[PDB]
Amino acid sequence: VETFAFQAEIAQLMSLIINTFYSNKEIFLRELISNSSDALDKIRYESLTDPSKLDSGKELHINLIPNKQDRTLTIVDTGIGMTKADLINNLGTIAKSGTKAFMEALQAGADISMIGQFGVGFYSAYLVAEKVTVITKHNDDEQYAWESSAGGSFTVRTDTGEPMGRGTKVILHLKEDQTEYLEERRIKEIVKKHSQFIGYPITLFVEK
Numbered sequence: 262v263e264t265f266a267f268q269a270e271i272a273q274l275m276s277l278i279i280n281t282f283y284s285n286k287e288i289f290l291r292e293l294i295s296n297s298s299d300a301l302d303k304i305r306y307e308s309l310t311d312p313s314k315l316d317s318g319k320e321l322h323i324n325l326i327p328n329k330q331d332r333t334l335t336i337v338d339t340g341i342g343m344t345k346a347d348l349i350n351n352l353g354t355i356a357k358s359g360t361k362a363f364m365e366a367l368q369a370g371a372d373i374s375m376i377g378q379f380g381v382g383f384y385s386a387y388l389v390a391e392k393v394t395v396i397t398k399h400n401d402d403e404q405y406a407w408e409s410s411a412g413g414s415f416t417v418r419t420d421t422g423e424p425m426g427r428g429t430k431v432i433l434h435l436k437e438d439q440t441e442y443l444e445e446r447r448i449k450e451i452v453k454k455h456s457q458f459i460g461y462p463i464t465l466f467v468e469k
């Protein structure tokens with residue numbers, strides 16, 4: 262297990278998201294679905310010139326999996342997945358300018374719902390989650406687990422759990438007061454409201 266510090270700008274963004282009073286929290290799901298859709302677009306495009314890239318799974322989709330027992334909501338996609346360098350370096354550097362611009366906007370009166378327009382909507386996960394675990398598998402690398410409860414650091418390790426094939430699974434460990442996002446009709450309402458134009462199937466797994 263390796264522990265890393267977030268880029269300073271991102272640690273500051275995370276602390277702001279965690280500490281600011283903001284009731285419109287449902288936007289997190291829209292942002293995570295939009296990120297999955299982007300990862301799905303990338304594998305779909307790559308597969309046009311090299312169909313062997315889908316050997317690890319031909320189905321391109323998004324699953325939403327609430328678990329009231331564990332208090333987690335999982336967003337799974339079969340997109341391109343992330344390499345170790347993506348997890349440690351790349352996502353951070355690509356987010357840096359967006360993060361700085363977003364913090365500046367928040368100063369000039371802009372609101373948290375605009376986070377997506379700056380390309381850093383992933384961190385809106387911390388509106389509802391006390392901890393986020395991400396399991397990922399890219400065709401060119403091993404399966405990894407990323408995890409952060411914020412506070413300035415994240416961890417990366419090789420994942421010895423169930424094999425994913427290809428893609429990314431975001432597991433939100435929800436804050437005690439945010440269990441509404443585990444409810445079937447609330448999830449449907451949110452997806453219909455924000456995510457009605459995504460070009461891949463989004464399937465809600467209903468709890469038994």
Ligand SMILES: CN1CCN(C(=O)c2cc(-c3nnc4ccc(Br)cn34)c(O)cc2O)CC1
Pocket residue numbers: 293296297299300301338340341342343347348352383395397407428429431
């Ligand atoms: C460069 N790309 C983008 C998306 N992608 C992915 O595999 C991918 C990334 C994120 C994601 N978006 N922001 C972050 C931040 C930290 C972590 Br961990 C994951 N993040 C996500 O929610 C879903 C995804 O399918 C493929 C590779």
